[PDB]
Design a protein around this ligand. Structure first.
Ligand code: PEF
Ligand code: NA
Length: 166
């Protein structure tokens, strides 16, 4: 099943992936949501094992971690204006988040390429490309019945920015 997949993930990872999956299921579709959750789960498990086997150091994720935190912060600044403006009016903050997430993608690919086979690399590009697209943020912020689900996601991203990775 899938219960053994999520157990090797910290609780903050389960919360974040759960809220993300809810969001994808709202704006996109169910198969896209389960696909993205399988992707993030596989990536995170393989990374955690690559660090536990000392194949890579914890500092090797410094740039990925920084870019992820910056994208999450930009998504918080944009979440401040949810329900008061449209996604086209908030294009600045959201494209800042998208650029940060693209940096996170490129550094993740840079780090994991000597280990993954090319299919898992393309899986990285697909996951980051979908979850970090400005069209994705545009669809989320324009949707009306998400404030409840988006609040859980932003709250999950906030407490990741509190766990300093060092
Ligand atoms: C768009 C983004 C897609 C990303 C998909 C690929 C997965 C990321 C791969 C790189 C790993 C990151 C660094 C790992 C360090 C680490 O994991 O440490 C941090 C904690 C601690 O864990 P610990 O104390 O047990 O171990 C520590 C021993 N070293 O773990 C986690 O909370 C993992 C959380 C993963 C982040 C979620 C990724 C998905 C984000 C989706 C939301 C963004 C879009 C929002 C749309 C509106
Ligand atoms: Na909602």
């Amino acid at each position: 099943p899938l219960s053994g997949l999520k157990k090797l993930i910290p609780e903050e990872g389960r919360e974040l992936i759960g809220s993300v999956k809810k969001i994808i299921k709202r704006v996109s579709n169910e198969e896209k949501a389960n696909e993205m959750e399988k992707n993030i789960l596989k990536i995170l498990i393989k990374v955690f094992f690559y660090i536990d086997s000392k194949a890579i150091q914890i500092g090797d994720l410094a740039k990925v971690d920084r870019a992820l935190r910056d994208g999450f912060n930009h998504l918080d600044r944009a979440f401040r204006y949810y329900g008061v403006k449209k996604a086209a009016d908030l294009v600045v903050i959201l494209e800042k988040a998208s650029t940060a997430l693209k940096e996170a993608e490129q550094e993740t690919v840079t780090l994991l390429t000597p280990f993954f086979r090319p299919h898992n690399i393309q899986l990285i590009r697909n996951t980051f490309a979908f979850l970090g697209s400005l069209d994705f943020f545009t669809k989320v912020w324009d949707d009306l019945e998400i404030e409840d689900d988006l609040f859980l996601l932003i709250s999950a991203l906030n407490k990741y920015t509190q766990i300093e990775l060092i």
